Amino acid sequence: IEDLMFEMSMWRCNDELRARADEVHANSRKDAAKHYIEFWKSIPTTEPYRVILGDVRDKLYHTRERAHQLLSNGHSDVPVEATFINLEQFLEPLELCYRSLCSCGDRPIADGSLLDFLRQVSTFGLSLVRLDIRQESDRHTDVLDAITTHLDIGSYREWSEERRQEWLLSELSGKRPLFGSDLPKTEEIADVLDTFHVIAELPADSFGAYIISMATAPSDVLAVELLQRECRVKQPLRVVPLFEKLADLEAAPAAVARLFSVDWYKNRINGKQEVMIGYSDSGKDAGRLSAAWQLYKAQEELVKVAKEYGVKLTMFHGRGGTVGR
Amino acid sequence: IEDLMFEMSMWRCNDELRARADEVHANSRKDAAKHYIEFWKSIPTTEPYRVILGDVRDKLYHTRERAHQLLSNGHSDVPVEATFINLEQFLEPLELCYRSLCSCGDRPIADGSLLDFLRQVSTFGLSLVRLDIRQESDRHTDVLDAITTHLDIGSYREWSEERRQEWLLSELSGKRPLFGSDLPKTEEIADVLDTFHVIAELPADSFGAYIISMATAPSDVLAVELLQRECRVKQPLRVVPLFEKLADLEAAPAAVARLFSVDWYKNRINGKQEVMIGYSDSGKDAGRLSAAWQLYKAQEELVKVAKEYGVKLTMFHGRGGTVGR
Secondary structure, three states: OHHHHHHOOOOOOOHHHHHHHHHHHHOOOOOOOOOOOOOOOOOOOOOHHHHHHHHHHHHHHHHHHHHHHHHHOOOOOOOHHHOOOOOOOOHHHHHHHHHHHHHOOOHHHHHHHHHHHHHHHHHHOOOOOOEEEEEEHHHHHHHHHHHHHHOOOOOOOOOOHHHHHHHHHHHHHOOOOOOOOOOOOOHHHHHHHHHHHHHHHOOHHHEEEEEEEOOOOHHHHHHHHHHHHHOOOOOOOEEEEEEOOHHHHHHHHHHHHHHHHOHHHHHHOOOEEEEEEEOOOHHHHOOHHHHHHHHHHHHHHHHHHHHHOOOEEEEEEEOOOOOOO | OHHHHHHOOOOOOOHHHHHHHHHHHHOOOOOOOOOOOOOOOOOOOOOHHHHHHHHHHHHHHHHHHHHHHHHHOOOOOOOHHHOOOOOOOOHHHHHHHHHHHHHOOOHHHHHHHHHHHHHHHHHHOOOOOOEEEEEEHHHHHHHHHHHHHHOOOOOOOOOOHHHHHHHHHHHHHOOOOOOOOOOOOOHHHHHHHHHHHHHHHOOHHHEEEEEEEOOOOHHHHHHHHHHHHHOOOOOOOEEEEEEOOHHHHHHHHHHHHHHHHOHHHHHHHOOEEEEEEEOOOHHHHOOHHHHHHHHHHHHHHHHHHHHHOOOEEEEEEEOOOOOOO
């Protein structure tokens, strides 16, 4: 940030950036701010891009500091308002700079360090990569079965796939808390639950997708959606099934089709769905040839299903480094 | 406590209290403790009663300081283990002192300042008086109706008393959280809920009874029991109805009998029940004479019901100072 501030020493800007620059200089905090190396003194409005980038620095410093304490200890006194919480509370000021520079015939300058910085922010965001969370179906099933058994309402394990779909739906559309503090938990049960609580506790742009291994039916996806909502995950992440064994690839288009059939879920999906395709285990229980060919057929029929339901499918290829995977 | 410690200067004790005093002098903490006025130095085993009472002092001091900060600010850094949490973690050491004194032929000594102090503890406890909480039934009814409306299941108001009893019972025996964080609340609704949370947050031995004004049916009491349980009131307090209007007194024995009929509630009440009898409003809408006579009849018939259901009744007389009330 400090080099960027150094280069952005223009004095011409548009009326928008001038207005905002005056805003920041109004609350510029006329203070020493001696901890900084460069630009330690209050930034004059003579250099407005530097005013704005300077506020970006104070927020970037405080973000790094909140994270550093949160990591070192169990808590931080840094107020979240002093930090970037949004993927683009960061991006807005940089865009304003870009527009202003272009307005004044300084487009080459904007396509210099500022552009590199824009692309870096829009590509890495507040946490370098988005993290995927993966877990096998049977663990979610164990959690739910503990929940229905504790509610003296049956056994989610023993239930037919239809019974599971219907129950999961009714609870998803409902407004009442499911389990409470007193739910009897295996260490595993609490493991999956606690990963959900952890996901809720953290920022959304820090996670990617929830991948379900050994996924067979829509109940498998609806189960994760329900567990997320119930674990007070404010912005739940996308659920995506994994088909890796040859049989699961053969069965994938049907299972995805059955899922998209459920109108409640296809309506909430916002027209986008991701599904993962494992390459490793297919050529291990059947031929390498037959695996590859079934993979091709599966990709083909899945895209057909998605087109049929007007959903843009993106396929996540669990390819390895070796041809055998 | 310091005056009492000064007096408890005996050197004879039984083997029980000797063992205990040796316990405290083991963790006596060879420390200055300069804030204290008297007995600021570590207490010798020559005077064992002073040792036990000395720990009683340290826990008493930390209690006053914890409450003092809790009141002055919003919090205290005092650890709860360093305070008296039980009505009688206080009493136990004093009892031990009394036993020791009697063992050694010092019953006259025991019946002096030590006795006065025992009676004071056992009578005022950690918070001078147990506080009663009173509220009218219709506020509980408003909260519940808000809950059933939010759960899309009907209107508790419009429900027959039978329906009310049935639902309340099913939820009291049930194990699922009722409302969640997202329950729409009036200022009133949040008033009653928040007083329940406040009861839950504080120690149990600080409260007495929940008194329900204008109580007419059992649903009025079951509402309070459920609202307590659902507001995670760890040790819910006893519910007690108020019959103040002349009609409510005529109908009171019937309504109390109906309440005792409920097998669950008679099971929870554990053979003790309190009911309040108002004197103020009775002689205001009808004659004073008719008020008194219906009051006598009421006491009589209530005792009849309690005897019939094998429950020890205590009657709470809402008398005034003037004969007119």
